[PDB]
Amino acid sequence: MVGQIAKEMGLRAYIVGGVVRDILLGKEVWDVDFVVEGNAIELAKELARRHGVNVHPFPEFGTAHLKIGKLKLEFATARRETEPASLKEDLIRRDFTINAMAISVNLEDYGTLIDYFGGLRDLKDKVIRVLHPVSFIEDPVRILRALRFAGRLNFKLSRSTEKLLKQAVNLGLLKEAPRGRLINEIKLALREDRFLEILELYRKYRVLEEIIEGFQWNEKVLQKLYALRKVVDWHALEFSEERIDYGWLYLLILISNLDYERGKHFLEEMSAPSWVRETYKFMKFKLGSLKEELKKAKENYEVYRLLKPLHTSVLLLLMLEEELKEKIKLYLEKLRKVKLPKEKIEELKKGKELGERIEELKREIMN
RNA sequence: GGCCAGGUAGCUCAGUUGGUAGAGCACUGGACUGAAAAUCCAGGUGUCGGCGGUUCGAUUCCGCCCCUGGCCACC
Numbered sequence: 001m002v003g004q005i006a007k008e009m010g011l012r013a014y015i016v017g018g019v020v021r022d023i024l025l026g027k028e029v030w031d032v033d034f035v036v037e038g039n040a041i042e043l044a045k046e047l048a049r050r051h052g053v054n055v056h057p058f059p060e061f062g063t064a065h066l067k068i069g070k071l072k073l074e075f076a077t078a079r080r081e082t083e084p085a086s087l088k089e090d091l092i093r094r095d096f097t098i099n100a101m102a103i104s105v106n107l108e109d110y111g112t113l114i115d116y117f118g119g120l121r122d123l124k125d126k127v128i129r130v131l132h133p134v135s136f137i138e139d140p141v142r143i144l145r146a147l148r149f150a151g152r153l154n155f156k157l158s159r160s161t162e163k164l165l166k167q168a169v170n171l172g173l174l175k176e177a178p179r180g181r182l183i184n185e186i187k188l189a190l191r192e193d194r195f196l197e198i199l200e201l202y203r204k205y206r207v208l209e210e211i212i213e214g215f216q217w218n219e220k221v222l223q224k225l226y227a228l229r230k231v232v233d234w235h236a237l238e239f240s241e242e243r244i245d246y247g248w249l250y251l252l253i254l255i256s257n258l259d260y261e262r263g264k265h266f267l268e269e270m271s272a273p274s275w276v277r278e279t280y281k282f283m284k285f286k287l288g289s290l291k292e293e294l295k296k297a298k299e300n301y302e303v304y305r306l307l308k309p310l311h312t313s314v315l316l317l318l319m320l321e322e323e324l325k326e327k328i329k330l331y332l333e334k335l336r337k338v339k340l341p342k343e344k345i346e347e348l349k350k351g352k353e354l355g356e357r358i359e360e361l362k363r364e365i366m367n
Numbered sequence: 368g369g370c371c372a373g374g375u376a377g378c379u380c381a382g383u384u385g386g387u388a389g390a391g392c393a394c395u396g397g398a399c400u401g402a403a404a405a406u407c408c409a410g411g412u413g414u415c416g417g418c419g420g421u422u423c424g425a426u427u428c429c430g431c432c433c434c435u436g437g438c439c440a441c442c
Protein backbone atom coordinates (compact mmCIF):
# COMPACT_ATOMS: atom_id res chain seq x y z
CA MET A 1 0.00 0.00 0.00
CA VAL A 2 3.06 2.22 0.51
CA GLY A 3 3.68 2.46 -3.23
CA GLN A 4 0.05 3.41 -3.77
CA ILE A 5 0.04 6.20 -1.19
CA ALA A 6 3.41 7.40 -2.49
CA LYS A 7 1.85 7.38 -5.96
CA GLU A 8 -1.06 9.54 -4.77
CA MET A 9 1.33 12.00 -3.11
CA GLY A 10 3.61 12.02 -6.15
CA LEU A 11 6.53 10.81 -4.05
CA ARG A 12 9.27 8.19 -4.21
CA ALA A 13 9.76 5.78 -1.31
CA TYR A 14 12.46 3.13 -0.86
CA ILE A 15 13.49 0.33 1.49
CA VAL A 16 16.99 1.23 2.65
CA GLY A 17 19.97 -0.02 4.65
CA GLY A 18 20.59 -3.27 6.50
CA VAL A 19 16.91 -4.03 6.04
CA VAL A 20 17.69 -4.46 2.34
CA ARG A 21 20.83 -6.44 3.16
CA ASP A 22 18.99 -8.98 5.33
CA ILE A 23 16.41 -9.30 2.54
CA LEU A 24 19.13 -10.21 0.05
CA LEU A 25 20.58 -12.39 2.81
CA GLY A 26 17.17 -14.05 2.99
CA LYS A 27 16.77 -13.14 6.66
CA GLU A 28 13.31 -11.75 7.39
CA VAL A 29 13.05 -8.92 9.91
CA TRP A 30 10.12 -7.02 11.40
CA ASP A 31 11.92 -3.67 11.25
CA VAL A 32 11.78 -1.87 7.91
CA ASP A 33 13.65 1.35 7.11
CA PHE A 34 12.16 3.77 4.58
CA VAL A 35 13.74 6.67 2.72
CA VAL A 36 11.26 9.05 1.12
CA GLU A 37 11.90 11.81 -1.42
CA GLY A 38 9.56 14.55 -0.26
CA ASN A 39 7.86 14.54 3.14
CA ALA A 40 7.98 11.15 4.87
CA ILE A 41 5.94 12.38 7.84
CA GLU A 42 2.67 12.86 5.94
CA LEU A 43 3.22 9.52 4.19
CA ALA A 44 3.63 7.75 7.52
CA LYS A 45 0.61 9.56 8.96
CA GLU A 46 -1.55 8.59 5.98
CA LEU A 47 -0.36 4.99 6.05
CA ALA A 48 -1.07 4.82 9.78
CA ARG A 49 -4.48 6.41 9.18
CA ARG A 50 -5.60 3.95 6.50
CA HIS A 51 -4.65 0.92 8.60
CA GLY A 52 -6.19 2.60 11.64
CA VAL A 53 -3.12 2.56 13.87
CA ASN A 54 -1.22 5.09 15.98
CA VAL A 55 1.61 7.21 14.57
CA HIS A 56 4.76 8.63 16.21
CA PRO A 57 5.95 11.76 14.33
CA PHE A 58 9.33 13.43 14.82
CA PRO A 59 9.29 16.72 12.82
CA GLU A 60 12.74 17.94 13.91
CA PHE A 61 14.32 14.65 12.85
CA GLY A 62 11.88 14.43 9.96
CA THR A 63 11.14 10.79 10.73
CA ALA A 64 7.99 8.95 11.80
CA HIS A 65 7.49 5.51 13.35
CA LEU A 66 4.37 3.34 13.10
CA LYS A 67 3.58 -0.28 13.97
CA ILE A 68 1.41 -2.60 11.90
CA GLY A 69 0.95 -6.05 13.40
CA LYS A 70 4.43 -7.33 14.20
CA LEU A 71 5.92 -4.98 11.60
CA LYS A 72 7.82 -1.94 12.86
CA LEU A 73 7.93 0.77 10.18
CA GLU A 74 10.20 3.82 10.13
CA PHE A 75 9.80 6.51 7.48
CA ALA A 76 12.69 8.93 7.01
CA THR A 77 13.15 11.91 4.69
CA ALA A 78 16.10 11.72 2.29
CA ARG A 79 19.04 13.72 3.67
CA ARG A 80 22.55 14.35 2.32
CA GLU A 81 24.07 15.04 5.74
CA THR A 82 23.69 13.38 9.14
CA GLU A 83 17.40 21.93 -1.06
CA PRO A 84 15.83 18.46 -1.46
CA ALA A 85 18.28 15.57 -1.08
CA SER A 86 18.35 12.76 -3.63
CA LEU A 87 18.28 9.11 -2.58
CA LYS A 88 21.87 8.67 -3.79
CA GLU A 89 22.96 11.46 -1.43
CA ASP A 90 21.20 9.72 1.45
CA LEU A 91 22.86 6.38 0.69
CA ILE A 92 26.36 7.82 0.28
CA ARG A 93 26.41 9.12 3.86
CA ARG A 94 26.15 5.54 5.12
CA ASP A 95 28.88 3.19 6.30
CA PHE A 96 29.42 0.13 4.08
CA THR A 97 28.48 -0.89 0.53
CA ILE A 98 26.21 -3.70 1.73
CA ASN A 99 24.29 -1.18 3.86
CA ALA A 100 24.28 1.42 1.08
CA MET A 101 21.71 -0.24 -1.19
CA ALA A 102 17.97 0.26 -1.71
CA ILE A 103 14.85 -1.47 -3.04
CA SER A 104 12.13 0.62 -4.70
CA VAL A 105 8.56 0.21 -3.42
CA ASN A 106 7.18 2.51 -6.13
CA LEU A 107 4.52 0.70 -8.17
CA GLU A 108 6.16 1.14 -11.58
CA ASP A 109 9.70 -0.09 -10.79
CA TYR A 110 8.53 -2.21 -7.82
CA GLY A 111 10.95 -5.01 -6.96
CA THR A 112 14.00 -3.22 -8.35
CA LEU A 113 17.18 -3.10 -6.26
CA ILE A 114 18.99 0.23 -6.52
CA ASP A 115 22.74 -0.08 -6.00
CA TYR A 116 25.09 2.77 -6.92
CA PHE A 117 28.31 1.72 -5.20
CA GLY A 118 28.32 -1.94 -6.19
CA GLY A 119 27.26 -3.20 -2.78
CA LEU A 120 25.69 -6.24 -4.42
CA ARG A 121 29.08 -7.36 -5.73
CA ASP A 122 30.64 -6.91 -2.29
CA LEU A 123 27.73 -8.84 -0.80
CA LYS A 124 28.40 -11.67 -3.25
CA ASP A 125 32.17 -11.45 -2.68
CA LYS A 126 31.75 -11.30 1.11
CA VAL A 127 33.51 -7.94 1.39
CA ILE A 128 33.11 -5.11 3.90
CA ARG A 129 33.96 -1.92 2.03
CA VAL A 130 33.72 1.74 3.01
CA LEU A 131 32.25 4.29 0.61
CA HIS A 132 34.98 6.91 1.05
CA PRO A 133 38.55 7.04 2.48
CA VAL A 134 37.45 9.41 5.26
CA SER A 135 34.72 7.02 6.46
CA PHE A 136 36.36 5.88 9.70
CA ILE A 137 37.61 9.40 10.40
CA GLU A 138 34.07 10.78 10.16
CA ASP A 139 32.57 8.15 12.46
CA PRO A 140 35.20 6.17 14.46
CA VAL A 141 32.38 3.98 15.83
CA ARG A 142 32.24 2.35 12.39
CA ILE A 143 35.66 0.83 13.17
CA LEU A 144 33.85 -1.52 15.54
CA ARG A 145 30.80 -1.94 13.31
CA ALA A 146 32.76 -3.22 10.32
CA LEU A 147 34.48 -5.84 12.45
CA ARG A 148 31.13 -6.74 13.99
CA PHE A 149 29.60 -7.21 10.55
CA ALA A 150 32.68 -9.12 9.42
CA GLY A 151 32.02 -11.28 12.46
CA ARG A 152 28.36 -11.98 11.74
CA LEU A 153 28.28 -12.38 7.97
CA ASN A 154 31.76 -13.92 7.92
CA PHE A 155 32.93 -11.28 5.46
CA LYS A 156 36.38 -9.79 4.95
CA LEU A 157 37.60 -6.20 4.99
CA SER A 158 38.90 -4.90 1.66
CA ARG A 159 42.56 -3.86 1.45
CA SER A 160 41.41 -0.25 1.21
CA THR A 161 38.99 -0.54 4.13
CA GLU A 162 41.56 -2.48 6.19
CA LYS A 163 44.37 0.04 5.69
CA LEU A 164 41.97 2.91 6.39
CA LEU A 165 40.75 1.18 9.56
CA LYS A 166 44.28 0.53 10.84
CA GLN A 167 45.15 4.17 10.10
CA ALA A 168 42.03 5.31 11.95
CA VAL A 169 42.98 3.28 15.03
CA ASN A 170 46.60 4.45 14.86
CA LEU A 171 45.43 8.06 15.14
CA GLY A 172 43.65 7.17 18.38
CA LEU A 173 40.34 8.33 16.95
CA LEU A 174 38.68 5.55 18.93
CA LYS A 175 39.38 7.55 22.10
CA GLU A 176 37.99 10.74 20.56
CA ALA A 177 34.73 8.97 19.71
CA PRO A 178 31.77 9.27 22.13
CA ARG A 179 31.98 6.65 24.89
CA GLY A 180 28.28 5.86 24.67
CA ARG A 181 28.20 4.95 20.99
CA LEU A 182 31.21 2.67 21.45
CA ILE A 183 29.83 0.95 24.54
CA ASN A 184 26.52 0.49 22.72
CA GLU A 185 28.42 -0.97 19.76
CA ILE A 186 30.09 -3.51 22.04
CA LYS A 187 26.70 -4.30 23.58
CA LEU A 188 25.44 -4.98 20.06
CA ALA A 189 28.53 -7.10 19.46
CA LEU A 190 28.21 -9.44 22.45
CA ARG A 191 24.66 -10.36 21.41
CA GLU A 192 26.00 -12.06 18.28
CA ASP A 193 26.43 -15.84 18.12
CA ARG A 194 29.58 -15.28 16.06
CA PHE A 195 30.70 -12.69 18.64
CA LEU A 196 33.84 -14.74 19.34
CA GLU A 197 35.01 -14.06 15.78
CA ILE A 198 34.27 -10.39 16.40
CA LEU A 199 36.54 -10.66 19.44
CA GLU A 200 39.20 -12.16 17.20
CA LEU A 201 38.83 -9.13 14.94
CA TYR A 202 39.00 -6.92 18.04
CA ARG A 203 42.27 -8.57 19.03
CA LYS A 204 43.71 -8.37 15.51
CA TYR A 205 43.15 -4.63 15.17
CA ARG A 206 43.60 -4.11 18.93
CA VAL A 207 40.58 -1.85 19.47
CA LEU A 208 39.92 -3.13 23.00
CA GLU A 209 43.24 -1.70 24.17
CA GLU A 210 41.96 1.68 22.98
CA ILE A 211 38.42 1.43 24.38
CA ILE A 212 39.12 -0.40 27.64
CA GLU A 213 41.73 1.16 29.93
CA GLY A 214 44.37 -1.30 31.13
CA PHE A 215 43.28 -4.13 28.84
CA GLN A 216 45.94 -6.32 27.20
CA TRP A 217 45.69 -9.60 25.29
CA ASN A 218 47.28 -12.88 26.39
CA GLU A 219 47.01 -16.57 25.52
CA LYS A 220 45.34 -17.86 28.70
CA VAL A 221 42.34 -15.58 28.17
CA LEU A 222 42.01 -16.70 24.55
CA GLN A 223 42.13 -20.39 25.48
CA LYS A 224 39.57 -19.58 28.17
CA LEU A 225 37.40 -18.05 25.45
CA TYR A 226 37.57 -21.13 23.23
CA ALA A 227 36.97 -23.40 26.22
CA LEU A 228 34.01 -21.19 27.10
CA ARG A 229 32.98 -21.56 23.46
CA LYS A 230 32.89 -25.34 23.81
CA VAL A 231 31.07 -25.19 27.16
CA VAL A 232 28.54 -22.73 25.72
CA ASP A 233 28.03 -25.06 22.75
CA TRP A 234 27.38 -28.11 24.95
CA HIS A 235 25.13 -26.24 27.40
CA ALA A 236 23.15 -24.62 24.58
CA LEU A 237 22.91 -28.08 23.05
CA GLU A 238 21.56 -30.33 25.81
CA PHE A 239 20.33 -27.70 28.29
CA SER A 240 19.04 -25.30 25.61
CA GLU A 241 15.76 -24.75 27.49
CA GLU A 242 17.91 -23.23 30.26
CA ARG A 243 19.77 -20.78 27.99
CA ILE A 244 20.99 -17.39 29.21
CA ASP A 245 23.00 -14.61 27.56
CA TYR A 246 26.39 -16.10 26.73
CA GLY A 247 28.24 -13.00 25.52
CA TRP A 248 28.43 -11.57 29.02
CA LEU A 249 30.42 -14.64 30.07
CA TYR A 250 33.02 -13.91 27.40
CA LEU A 251 33.00 -10.29 28.56
CA LEU A 252 33.73 -11.48 32.10
CA ILE A 253 36.57 -13.67 30.83
CA LEU A 254 38.09 -10.70 28.99
CA ILE A 255 38.04 -8.48 32.09
CA SER A 256 39.02 -11.31 34.46
CA ASN A 257 42.63 -10.15 34.80
CA LEU A 258 41.61 -6.49 34.99
CA ASP A 259 41.44 -4.54 38.25
CA TYR A 260 38.15 -4.72 40.16
CA GLU A 261 37.84 -0.94 39.92
CA ARG A 262 38.17 -0.81 36.13
CA GLY A 263 36.02 -3.94 35.87
CA LYS A 264 33.19 -2.53 37.96
CA HIS A 265 33.47 0.78 36.09
CA PHE A 266 33.38 -0.94 32.69
CA LEU A 267 30.43 -3.16 33.62
CA GLU A 268 28.81 0.01 34.94
CA GLU A 269 29.28 1.68 31.56
CA MET A 270 28.05 -1.43 29.74
CA SER A 271 24.79 -1.39 31.71
CA ALA A 272 25.27 -5.10 32.41
CA PRO A 273 22.49 -7.24 33.95
CA SER A 274 22.49 -7.90 37.70
CA TRP A 275 23.51 -11.55 37.36
CA VAL A 276 26.52 -10.41 35.34
CA ARG A 277 27.70 -8.11 38.13
CA GLU A 278 27.03 -10.83 40.70
CA THR A 279 28.90 -13.45 38.66
CA TYR A 280 31.81 -11.03 38.18
CA LYS A 281 32.07 -10.05 41.85
CA PHE A 282 31.86 -13.75 42.69
CA MET A 283 34.50 -14.63 40.09
CA LYS A 284 37.03 -12.03 41.23
CA PHE A 285 37.08 -13.26 44.84
CA LYS A 286 35.14 -16.30 46.05
CA LEU A 287 35.66 -18.34 42.86
CA GLY A 288 39.13 -19.56 43.83
CA SER A 289 38.14 -20.72 47.31
CA LEU A 290 35.03 -22.27 45.75
CA LYS A 291 37.20 -24.30 43.39
CA GLU A 292 39.43 -25.29 46.31
CA GLU A 293 36.32 -26.51 48.12
CA LEU A 294 35.17 -28.42 45.03
CA LYS A 295 38.55 -30.16 45.02
CA LYS A 296 37.91 -31.27 48.60
CA ALA A 297 34.46 -32.54 47.65
CA LYS A 298 33.91 -36.22 48.42
CA GLU A 299 30.20 -36.85 49.01
CA ASN A 300 27.64 -35.67 46.45
CA TYR A 301 25.68 -33.66 49.02
CA GLU A 302 28.60 -31.31 49.61
CA VAL A 303 28.73 -30.72 45.86
CA TYR A 304 24.99 -30.06 45.98
CA ARG A 305 25.27 -27.51 48.81
CA LEU A 306 28.20 -25.78 47.08
CA LEU A 307 26.53 -25.66 43.66
CA LYS A 308 22.72 -25.31 43.86
CA PRO A 309 22.67 -21.80 45.38
CA LEU A 310 24.86 -20.55 42.51
CA HIS A 311 23.54 -19.28 39.18
CA THR A 312 24.03 -21.10 35.87
CA SER A 313 26.72 -18.64 34.77
CA VAL A 314 28.89 -19.53 37.76
CA LEU A 315 28.54 -23.22 36.89
CA LEU A 316 29.51 -22.56 33.27
CA LEU A 317 32.56 -20.72 34.62
CA LEU A 318 33.27 -23.77 36.79
CA MET A 319 33.20 -26.00 33.71
CA LEU A 320 36.38 -24.24 32.56
CA GLU A 321 38.28 -26.53 34.92
CA GLU A 322 39.00 -29.97 33.45
CA GLU A 323 38.74 -31.78 36.78
CA LEU A 324 35.50 -30.03 37.71
CA LYS A 325 33.85 -30.51 34.30
CA GLU A 326 32.45 -34.04 34.66
CA LYS A 327 31.48 -33.17 38.24
CA ILE A 328 29.43 -30.16 37.15
CA LYS A 329 27.83 -32.18 34.34
CA LEU A 330 27.00 -35.00 36.77
CA TYR A 331 25.37 -32.38 39.00
CA LEU A 332 23.44 -31.09 35.98
CA GLU A 333 21.86 -34.07 34.22
CA LYS A 334 21.66 -36.33 37.28
CA LEU A 335 22.22 -35.09 40.85
CA ARG A 336 19.58 -32.36 41.15
CA LYS A 337 16.86 -34.52 39.59
CA VAL A 338 14.79 -36.54 42.10
CA LYS A 339 11.41 -36.63 43.87
CA LEU A 340 9.32 -38.38 46.54
CA PRO A 341 5.85 -40.03 46.61
CA LYS A 342 2.84 -39.06 48.74
CA GLU A 343 2.74 -41.29 51.84
CA LYS A 344 6.48 -40.95 52.46
CA ILE A 345 6.43 -37.14 52.44
CA GLU A 346 3.28 -37.29 54.57
CA GLU A 347 5.35 -39.28 57.08
CA LEU A 348 8.14 -36.71 56.76
CA LYS A 349 5.85 -33.83 57.72
CA LYS A 350 4.49 -35.89 60.64
CA GLY A 351 9.01 -24.75 60.21
CA LYS A 352 12.66 -24.83 59.16
CA GLU A 353 13.01 -28.26 60.77
CA LEU A 354 11.01 -29.74 57.89
CA GLY A 355 13.61 -28.27 55.54
CA GLU A 356 16.56 -29.58 57.54
CA ARG A 357 14.90 -33.00 57.69
CA ILE A 358 14.29 -33.00 53.93
CA GLU A 359 17.97 -32.11 53.47
CA GLU A 360 18.94 -35.04 55.71
CA LEU A 361 16.76 -37.32 53.59
CA LYS A 362 18.32 -36.03 50.37
CA ARG A 363 21.84 -36.56 51.71
CA GLU A 364 20.59 -39.97 52.83
CA ILE A 365 19.49 -40.79 49.27
CA MET A 366 22.59 -39.40 47.53
CA ASN A 367 25.33 -41.07 49.58
C1' G B 368 14.87 -0.31 22.07
C1' G B 369 19.17 -1.38 26.56
C1' C B 370 19.67 -0.80 31.85
C1' C B 371 18.82 0.73 36.92
C1' A B 372 15.76 1.45 40.58
C1' G B 373 10.83 1.53 42.44
C1' G B 374 5.38 -2.27 42.60
C1' U B 375 3.65 -3.90 50.44
C1' A B 376 -3.11 -2.08 52.87
C1' G B 377 -7.51 3.27 50.72
C1' C B 378 -2.88 6.67 50.95
C1' U B 379 2.17 7.56 52.52
C1' C B 380 6.50 3.68 53.75
C1' A B 381 10.45 -0.56 56.09
C1' G B 382 11.25 -6.20 55.46
C1' U B 383 17.75 -11.54 52.68
C1' U B 384 20.97 -16.93 55.17
C1' G B 385 13.35 -19.69 51.17
C1' G B 386 9.90 -21.70 56.81
C1' U B 387 3.60 -19.68 59.01
C1' A B 388 4.29 -10.84 57.58
C1' G B 389 4.25 -4.91 59.83
C1' A B 390 3.69 1.29 61.23
C1' G B 391 0.85 6.31 61.01
C1' C B 392 -4.55 7.79 59.45
C1' A B 393 -9.55 5.70 56.59
C1' C B 394 -13.15 -0.10 57.39
C1' U B 395 -16.92 -3.03 59.60
C1' G B 396 -19.32 -4.32 64.58
C1' G B 397 -20.32 -3.59 69.62
C1' A B 398 -19.53 -1.01 74.53
C1' C B 399 -20.48 4.66 74.85
C1' U B 400 -24.73 8.64 72.84
C1' G B 401 -31.08 12.05 72.31
C1' A B 402 -27.88 12.04 67.50
C1' A B 403 -22.75 12.51 66.36
C1' A B 404 -17.63 12.69 67.46
C1' A B 405 -13.74 11.35 70.55
C1' U B 406 -11.94 7.16 72.95
C1' C B 407 -11.51 1.79 74.79
C1' C B 408 -11.66 -3.46 73.55
C1' A B 409 -10.37 -5.10 69.56
C1' G B 410 -10.01 -7.11 65.19
C1' G B 411 -10.50 -6.86 57.72
C1' U B 412 -5.79 -3.75 57.33
C1' G B 413 -2.74 -8.16 52.18
C1' U B 414 -3.47 -14.27 46.27
C1' C B 415 3.50 -8.17 49.07
C1' G B 416 2.57 -6.43 39.98
C1' G B 417 0.63 -10.46 36.23
C1' C B 418 1.65 -15.43 34.23
C1' G B 419 4.80 -19.96 33.95
C1' G B 420 9.04 -22.84 35.64
C1' U B 421 12.64 -24.92 39.64
C1' U B 422 11.67 -26.44 44.78
C1' C B 423 8.11 -30.57 49.72
C1' G B 424 7.31 -25.30 50.03
C1' A B 425 8.82 -18.85 46.21
C1' U B 426 7.41 -11.53 48.16
C1' U B 427 12.93 -14.28 47.59
C1' C B 428 15.82 -18.27 42.51
C1' C B 429 14.85 -17.69 37.24
C1' G B 430 12.12 -16.76 32.61
C1' C B 431 8.33 -14.17 29.96
C1' C B 432 5.06 -9.66 30.35
C1' C B 433 2.11 -5.10 32.88
C1' C B 434 2.73 -0.27 35.18
C1' U B 435 5.68 4.25 36.90
C1' G B 436 10.25 7.19 37.36
C1' G B 437 15.19 7.98 35.93
C1' C B 438 20.06 7.26 32.92
C1' C B 439 20.44 6.81 27.50
C1' A B 440 20.89 4.57 22.17
C1' C B 441 17.13 7.95 20.35
C1' C B 442 21.33 6.19 12.74
Ligand SMILES: Nc1ncnc2c1ncn2[C@@H]1O[C@H](COP(=O)(O)OP(=O)(O)OP(=O)(O)O)[C@@H](O)[C@H]1O
Pocket residue numbers: 016017018019093094095096099100139141142188442
Ligand atom coordinates in the same frame (compact mmCIF):
# COMPACT_ATOMS: atom_id res chain seq x y z
N1 LIG C 1 27.71 5.06 12.26
C1 LIG C 1 27.06 4.96 11.09
N2 LIG C 1 27.51 5.59 9.98
C2 LIG C 1 26.86 5.49 8.80
N3 LIG C 1 25.73 4.78 8.62
C3 LIG C 1 25.17 4.11 9.65
C4 LIG C 1 25.81 4.17 10.97
N4 LIG C 1 25.06 3.41 11.80
C5 LIG C 1 24.02 2.92 11.07
N5 LIG C 1 24.09 3.34 9.79
C6 LIG C 1 23.12 2.99 8.73
O1 LIG C 1 21.80 3.05 9.27
C7 LIG C 1 21.19 1.77 9.32
C8 LIG C 1 20.80 1.50 10.76
O2 LIG C 1 20.44 0.13 10.95
P1 LIG C 1 20.65 -0.47 12.42
O3 LIG C 1 20.94 0.72 13.30
O4 LIG C 1 19.49 -1.38 12.75
O5 LIG C 1 21.97 -1.38 12.29
P2 LIG C 1 22.01 -2.61 11.27
O6 LIG C 1 23.10 -2.36 10.26
O7 LIG C 1 20.61 -2.87 10.79
O8 LIG C 1 22.49 -3.83 12.20
P3 LIG C 1 21.53 -4.41 13.37
O9 LIG C 1 20.29 -4.86 12.63
O10 LIG C 1 22.33 -5.52 14.00
O11 LIG C 1 21.27 -3.21 14.24
C9 LIG C 1 22.20 0.76 8.80
O12 LIG C 1 21.62 -0.03 7.76
C10 LIG C 1 23.36 1.57 8.26
O13 LIG C 1 23.36 1.53 6.84
